[PDB]
Design a protein around this nucleic acid. Structure first.
Ligand code: XG4
Ligand code: MN
Ligand code: MN
Length: 425
DNA sequence: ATTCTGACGCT
């Protein structure tokens, strides 16, 4: 009872941009705004592969991983923006720079952990404490939460439902107790409204957010009312929320591990995990995963918001599927050089912006007919930012995969160069 | 023949 800690010590938010690459293209090209539109990579094979879809286009069934030619069958009016092509490959620089715009705004409010090109976690515990002291017992008005949903409310038109649930929540709040976790989350949500307003004012981009006591619940909360809304998931909301939540929806369980939880335990929903002992879960899934699962299904997770805004690696990849696979020495060399030229550009800019240098070069390849996504992964020293040296070293390190007797066999279906092991500069 | 990333765990 009094000694079962409840994982209510922190206020954590997850901010995720709405259809991010589409919004970047819509800001640049006003003719795309408020239209069914998507962003593709390449164009020749089936019109290109879609990686981002506006919410208008999602209403017709357009999804990521769809070929644009197929999406047009669902949505004949679909508008398309193509990712930039440089040195014969997709170049995501525009979206990386847009990401930095957003991250720099979020960093004004609190320490953030970049979790992807378009999302960051925010540790708001200290900011909430400061703001609670600033309010000096003053209640929290619904006007301060104009885009917030309270998960699980109302209890007992979409905007009308939203506001009913918010009123129920706010009428229940104990504002005089500076230590109430529910009040702390509410103040967190006020700050996140301010952060999201700043992002939209200063970039034009809309985003959604989750506010809860840890990263997993904040990420889950984010997706519940996208787009352009934020969602507060309280500790008390967890039993009902998890009682029908498929296990695969929880971050890290969308893959083989979640499938094995489902199959070994004979369950479907996160909440059903509560019926197992910590030792039982550790027995099936290992000591780390088992402890994590035991706490997670009760709404509890301890993973910190890491102070890390910048990527830890800078990588350059290209697939060569089907008959396009690289089958000569000259081909492999030329593409390694293209990859290294983009890597050198991004690294030189990184070194000037972020006062750091990469020290290790990772080379990964796939060969045709190989089941694995990495037929080989080998590292070497990254001593200078020179594309010719990096491409020559990558070839030196992969060349003994060639079984030919000028030819390359098995043909390569993927090349990948990644700079890692950064040190201050 | 979604492709192009990037974090993190295991051994
Ligand atoms: N190259 C590449 N980029 C991708 C891929 N998947 C996503 N991206 C890029 C394009 C995406 O815009 C961006 C962020 O991915 P999300 O946050 O998962 N989706 P979004 O923000 O579009 O919509 P929502 O409102 O549902 O969050 O990452 C992929 O497989 N490949
Ligand atoms: Mn997003
Ligand atoms: Mn995202």
């Amino acid at each position: 009872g009094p000694h079962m800690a409840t994982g209510q010590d922190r206020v954590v938010a997850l901010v995720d941009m709405d259809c991010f690459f589409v919004q970047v293209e819509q800001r640049q090209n006003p003719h795309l705004r408020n239209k069914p539109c998507a962003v593709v990579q390449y164009k020749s094979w089936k019109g290109g592969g879609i990686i981002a879809v506006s919410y208008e286009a999602r209403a017709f069934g357009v999804t990521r991983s769809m070929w644009a030619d197929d999406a047009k069958k669902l949505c004949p009016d679909l508008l398309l923006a193509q990712v930039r092509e440089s040195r014969g490959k997709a170049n995501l620089t525009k979206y990386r720079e847009a990401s930095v715009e957003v991250m720099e705004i979020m960093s004004r409010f609190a320490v953030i952990e970049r979790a992807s090109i378009d999302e960051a976690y925010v540790d708001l515990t200290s900011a909430v404490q400061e703001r609670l002291q600033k309010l000096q017992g003053q209640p929290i008005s619904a006007d301060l939460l104009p885009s917030t949903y309270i998960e699980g409310l109302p209890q007992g038109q979409k905007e009308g439902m939203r506001k009913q649930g918010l009123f129920q929540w706010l009428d229940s709040l104990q504002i005089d107790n500076l230590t109430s976790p529910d009040l702390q989350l509410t103040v967190g949500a006020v700050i996140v409204e301010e952060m999201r307003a700043a992002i939209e004012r200063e970039t034009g981009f809309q985003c959604s957010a989750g506010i809860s006591h840890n990263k997993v619940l904040a990420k889950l909360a984010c997706g519940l009312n996208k787009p352009n809304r934020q969602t507060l998931v309280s500790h008390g909301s967890v039993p009902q929320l998890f009682s029908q939540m498929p296990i695969r929806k929880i971050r890290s369980l969308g893959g083989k591990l979640g499938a094995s939880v489902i199959e070994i335990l004979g369950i479907e929903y996160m909440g059903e995990l509560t019926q197992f002992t910590e030792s039982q879960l550790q027995s099936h899934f290992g000591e780390k995963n088992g402890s994590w699962l035991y706490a997670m299904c009760r709404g509890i997770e301890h993973d910190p918001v890491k102070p890390r805004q910048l990527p830890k690696t800078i990588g350059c990849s290209k697939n060569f599927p089907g008959k396009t696979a690289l089958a000569t020495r000259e081909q492999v060399q030329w593409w390694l050089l293209q990859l290294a030229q983009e890597l050198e550009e991004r690294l030189t800019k990184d070194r000037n912006d972020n006062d750091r240098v990469a020290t290790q070069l990772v080379v990964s390849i796939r060969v045709q007919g190989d089941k694995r996504l990495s037929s080989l992964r080998r590292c070497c020293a990254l001593t200078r930012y020179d594309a010719h040296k990096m491409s020559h070293d990558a070839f030196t390190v992969i060349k003994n995969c060639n079984t030919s007797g000028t030819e390359w066999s098995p043909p390569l279906t993927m090349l990948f160069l990644c700079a890692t092991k950064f040190s201050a500069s």
